[PDB]
Write a protein that binds this ligand. Structure first.
Ligand code: ZN
Ligand code: ZN
Length: 216
């Protein structure tokens, strides 16, 4: 029950300012895998759509933080067509300027944050649409779009290659994919890539599926 208690606490109409303690605990729960991102983001979205603009604004601040801090598992839940449509709709019916302004702030911030990720293009597409419709965005600060690097996965040991199942031995050395942490023979891990999301800016060994996910 902790995620839910905290979300309630963070979006209380009693608050005079952002409850950073509760927000950062919510971020930690998602990063640690204690709370699933889809459920978390769905729960926050329910609050974003509240008729009370204080609740909606506080919920948008929770959304801002989970996106900034929680990595791809959360980005997958916001940088999609369903969410962009819901925010376009919300922005169109919202009569409260601070909620409106925050939606614009976030769309702009995310569109810049996601500029290297083709799977997330719908956010930049939505930004451009909104500008054509006449929305005046707040001035952009680089700081808005600077997200926390994610933690690279721990490496797995095993007796055989994760892909081809060859047995490791003297003539078949163990290697690891830096992107997923699984264990491979050399034949199955002969690709090299940067991994920006983990702050890896040198080309490091990856498996073939990770290589293709990374080099779209
Ligand atoms: Zn192999
Ligand atoms: Zn991999």
């Amino acid at each position: 029950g902790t995620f839910e208690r905290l979300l309630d606490k963070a979006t209380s109409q009693l608050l005079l300012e952002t409850d950073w303690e509760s927000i950062l605990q919510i971020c930690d729960l998602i990063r640690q895998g204690d709370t699933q991102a889809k459920y978390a983001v769905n729960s926050i979205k329910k609050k974003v759509n509240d008729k009370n603009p204080h609740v909606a604004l506080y919920a948008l601040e929770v959304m801002e933080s989970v996106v900034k801090n929680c990595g791809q598992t959360v980005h997958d839940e916001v940088a999609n067509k369903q969410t962009m449509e819901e925010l376009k709709d919300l922005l169109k019916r919202q009569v409260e300027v601070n909620v409106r302004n925050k939606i614009l702030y976030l769309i702009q911030a995310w569109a810049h944050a996601f500029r290297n990720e083709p799977k997330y293009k719908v956010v930049q597409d939505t930004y451009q649409i909104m500008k054509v419709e006449g929305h005046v965005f707040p001035e952009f600060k680089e700081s808005d779009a600077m997200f926390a690097a994610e933690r690279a996965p721990d490496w797995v040991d095993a007796e055989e290659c994760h892909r081809c199942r060859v047995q490791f031995g003297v003539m078949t050395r163990k290697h690891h994919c830096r992107a997923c942490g699984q264990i491979f023979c050399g034949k199955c891990s002969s690709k090299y890539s940067t991994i920006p999301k983990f702050g890896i800016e040198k080309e490091v060994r990856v498996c073939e599926p990770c290589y293709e996910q990374l080099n779209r």
